[PDB]
Curated annotation (Swiss-Prot):
It is found in: Nucleus. It comes from the Eukaryota. Coiled coil: none annotated. Belongs to the HDGF family. Disulfide bonds: none annotated. Residues 11-68 form the PWWP domain. The chain holds residues 8 to 90 of 202 of the full protein. Enhances DNA synthesis and may play a role in cell proliferation. This is Hepatoma-derived growth factor-related protein 3.
Length: 96
């Protein structure tokens, strides 16, 4: 139990990622390997589930999964999207 809003996302959290004209895509906060691209400060390695794509977004383009899980986490059927909506549910702490 740890006071602080701490609205700045961390690896292993889950989010919705909105690209320009795509849905609120199911995505995860990942971490960075010991040798890949350096993003700009504030941004995160967002991994887009069901398409497995990688882009850099900052927190304003992004939404906390548990706040939008039922709002945005719904069957948008874009191809990949039903996979990623399964992948994200089954990625996160569930049943425990």
């Amino acid at each position: 139990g740890s006071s602080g809003s701490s609205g700045e996302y961390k690896a292993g959290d889950l989010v919705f990622a909105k690209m320009k004209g795509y849905p609120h895509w199911p995505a995860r906060i990942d971490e960075l390997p010991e040798g890949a691209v350096k993003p700009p400060a504030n941004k995160y390695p967002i991994f887009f589930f069901g398409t497995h794509e990688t882009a850099f977004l900052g927190p304003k383009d992004l939404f906390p999964y548990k706040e939008y899980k039922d709002k945005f986490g719904k069957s948008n059927k874009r191809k990949g999207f039903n996979e990623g909506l399964w992948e994200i549910e089954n990625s996160g702490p569930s049943s425990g």
